[PDB]
Design a protein around this ligand. Structure first.
Ligand SMILES: Nc1nc2c(ncn2[C@@H]2O[C@H](COP(=O)(O)OP(=O)(O)O)[C@@H](O)[C@H]2O)c(=O)[nH]1
Lengths: 340, 56, 335
């Protein structure tokens, strides 16, 4: 025919483009982040943009304004609610009125704005010694690790012309519910990094989608070791992370995938281990309660879960994911492990 | 949350309990008879002549 | 606790429903068909191989002309094929490669797809460009089917289904009730109802107009990954991680037949009836599609042309062919 020839030629042209695209895709480095909630995955993704793509524009930063405020409000609310549960009194009784007003105001707040009234309530609460006593007992409830970051900077944050900084954006907890993907180039190679931490669905229905990735970066919050085991009491948080790592590292879907282990939040760990003993997490631990020996112990507890040890190496690095210079050095570590 | 989930499940079950269900035998007969009127012309049952197969 | 009272009440109502279903199980499908002759050995051959994807294929859907079909792969491509000639008509570059479902509009004017981006994207074939990105689900898109060029229904890992107005991009209706990821849906012939299958191991029948669940069907021991209506609109089939397919009857409100064999312990990914309903075709994790006699529960044939999981399949509206798609990156056309 006439049309039939053109349809054949169209198909052949599609075939060429598909082949060229596949050849470019076979050359890219694909990195999947995994790890428990709050372990640092979305922070690492943002750090790749800051390091390799010049960070965030001012207009991009303006868009995190509303989540900075929502994060801040939810942090102080969490501390106040815990005072009732832990039976902690205010340092000044007048703060009870402020606490009441906190809840009234939080319902009336408009996104992207914080009234001077609400800012003053939060400031007075955060300064109160009873609120601070509860904050310092955060291992007994659920409190995100950026709480003090924002609350200590409330004066700057609350200005009507406030524009979030890049560090502010790094610290935000925006809960996307879908996959997050970032692309960059590092030494003439195309990298793609994925984070599914926002997905609340059933992991067994899509983990196999990542069979074939070059490497997994598994993130662990070192500072989770002393969190009290509460409603669900099968395992403490660190042992839940160990069970997930055991599952991933030894997974049939990742036989040919390099396993990188980021033992993250080392800055919070270094401070916690001064007053909170590792035995809270590992009752059998008989070493000293110091940064170096306790960190080593955790590293070995995870590395020991590798079952194909003889064929498979774990690339372990201690990180502070909110420190761009620290992440840039760990990134170099990761490059070496995967490219060759 | 969970309590809110149980209330809705209970509400839904209260509706489903009131359904008037047909005998399985009757439904099976109707299923069979629908298939029997048509399986004789079903290409994946009876096969296709080579000359009439558009995928030859 | 009040919590204690609600849990026991739910179990009591589930038991009442179980008893009422039992009170209507006066006979079984196997008895009713005892006198029908077996279909005999079904032996189909691969007639067309659709080569082009470079990674796992996750879904496919036939156009209503029984000739064109769309496939979706995590190579990041939606390909529209002319199955008669194997020519590629379109190769659409997705914005997110993590696709899990696709659909061909009955008119032939649009296709849809989505996945881990939690978005259902609509593509106009008759301008190819992204016409709409339907945002609202909080979990992956697992299945989607057009009612017409203006409305589409979706299922999601967020445990809901939704009906969308494509022009406005808004969810017109949300279908809530499943307690696990929803994996598949199928529209009734008259598009007034649809059924969904979920990781709570149940299937649900939904009223499109009134946005409510009418019936909840139970019996599977693990996730339902695939669901397909029977052509007369009064029954449907499910395929499950529990290595069984089952036939469910709407008006009996209960399971009629299980299709399984002690040999088969792997999961089922996809189910379809042949045009008459005599055959139920199912794709399996073990790389095969098994062809069941829907009336007798005997396995009548096998389709074994793949080197990895059969992830999807579909029968043409004219009944002339079945398509299989696979993690091995191929689709095959059989009859
Ligand atoms: N101090 C400190 N905070 C961190 C570190 N890594 C992450 N965070 C913070 O901890 C919180 C949870 O981290 P995020 O990346 O959102 O965890 P994700 O759930 O795995 O994505 C965020 O507020 C981060 O700012 C770290 O190494 N040190």
């Amino acid at each position: 025919s006439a049309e039939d020839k053109a349809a054949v030629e169209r198909s052949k042209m599609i075939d060429r483009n598909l082949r060229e695209d596949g050849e470019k895709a076979a050359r890219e480095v694909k990195l999947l982040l995994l790890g428990a909630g709050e372990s640092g995955k979305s922070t690492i993704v943002k750090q790749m943009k800051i390091i390799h793509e010049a960070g965030y524009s001012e207009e991009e930063c303006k868009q995190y304004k509303a989540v900075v405020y929502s994060n801040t409000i939810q942090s102080i609310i969490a501390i106040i609610r815990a005072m009732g549960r832990l039976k902690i009194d205010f340092g000044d009784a007048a703060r009870a009125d402020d606490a009441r007003q906190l809840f009234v105001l939080a319902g009336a707040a408009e996104e992207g704005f914080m009234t001077a009234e609400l800012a003053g309530v939060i400031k007075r609460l955060w300064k109160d010694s009873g609120v601070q006593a509860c904050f310092n007992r955060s291992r007994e409830y659920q409190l995100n690790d950026s709480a003090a970051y924002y609350l200590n900077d409330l004066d700057r944050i609350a200005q009507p012309n406030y524009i979030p900084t890049q560090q502010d954006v790094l610290r935000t907890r925006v809960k996307t519910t879908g996959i997050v993907e970032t692309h960059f180039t590092f030494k003439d190679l195309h990298f793609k990094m994925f984070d599914v931490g926002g997905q609340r669905s059933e992991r067994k229905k899509w983990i196999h989608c990542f069979e074939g990735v070059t490497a997994i970066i598994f993130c662990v919050a070192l500072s989770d070791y002393d969190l009290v085991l509460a409603e669900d009491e099968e395992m403490n948080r660190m042992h839940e992370s160990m069970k997930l790592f055991d599952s991933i590292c030894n997974n049939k879907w990742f036989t040919d995938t390099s396993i990188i282990l980021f033992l993250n939040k080392k800055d919070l760990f270094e401070e916690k281990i001064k007053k909170s003993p590792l035995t809270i997490c590992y009752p059998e631990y008989a070493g000293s309660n110091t940064y170096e020996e306790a960190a080593a112990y955790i590293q070995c507890q995870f590395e020991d879960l590798n079952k194909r040890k003889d064929t498979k190496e774990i690339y372990t690095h201690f990180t502070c994911a909110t420190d761009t210079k620290n992440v840039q050095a760990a990134a170099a570590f990761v490059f070496d492990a995967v490219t060759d | 949350t969970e309590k809110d989930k149980l209330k809705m499940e209970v509400d839904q079950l209260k509706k489903e309990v009131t359904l008037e269900r047909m005998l399985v035998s009757k439904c099976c007969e109707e299923f069979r008879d629908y298939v029997e009127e048509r399986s004789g012309e079903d290409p994946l049952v009876k096969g296709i002549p080579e000359d009439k197969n558009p995928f030859k | 606790s009040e919590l204690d009272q609600l849990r026991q009440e739910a179990e009591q109502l589930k038991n009442q429903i179980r008893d009422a279903r039992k009170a209507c199980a006066d006979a079984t499908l196997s008895q009713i068909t005892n006198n029908i002759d077996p279909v005999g050995r079904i032996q189909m051959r691969t007639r067309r191989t659709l080569r082009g994807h470079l990674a796992k294929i996750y879904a496919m859907h036939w156009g209503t002309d029984s000739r064109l079909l769309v496939s979706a792969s995590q190579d990041g491509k939606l390909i529209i094929w002319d199955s008669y000639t194997t020519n590629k008509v379109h190769a659409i570059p997705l914005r997110s490669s993590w696709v899990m479902t696709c659909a061909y509009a009955p008119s032939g004017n649009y296709v849809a797809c989505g996945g881990l981006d939690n978005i259902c994207s609509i593509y106009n074939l008759k301008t190819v460009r992204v016409s709409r990105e339907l945002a609202g689900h909080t979990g992956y898109l697992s299945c989607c089917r057009f009612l017409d060029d203006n409305q589409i229904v979706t299922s999601s890992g967020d445990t809901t289904c939704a009906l969308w107005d494509i022009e406005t991009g808004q969810q017109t209706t949300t279908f809530t009730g499943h307690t696990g990821d929803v994996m598949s849906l199928s529209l009734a012939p008259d598009t007034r109802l649809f059924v969904s299958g979920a990781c709570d191991a149940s299937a649900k029948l939904w009223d499109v107009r009134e946005g409510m669940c009418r019936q909840t069907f139970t019996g599977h021991e693990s996730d339902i990954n695939a669901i397909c209506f029977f052509p007369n609109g009064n029954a449907f089939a499910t395929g499950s991680d529990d290595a069984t397919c089952r036939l469910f009857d709407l008006r009996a409100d209960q399971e009629l037949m299980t299709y399984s064999h002690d040999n088969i312990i792997c999961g089922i990914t996809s189910v379809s009836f042949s045009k008459s309903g005599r055959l139920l075709l199912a794709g399996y994790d073990d790389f095969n599609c098994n062809v069941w006699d829907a009336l007798k529960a005997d396995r009548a044939g096998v389709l074994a042309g793949h080197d990895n999981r059969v992830s999807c399949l579909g029968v043409t509206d004219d009944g002339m062919a079945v398509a299989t798609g696979s993690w091995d990156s191929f689709l095959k056309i059989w009859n």
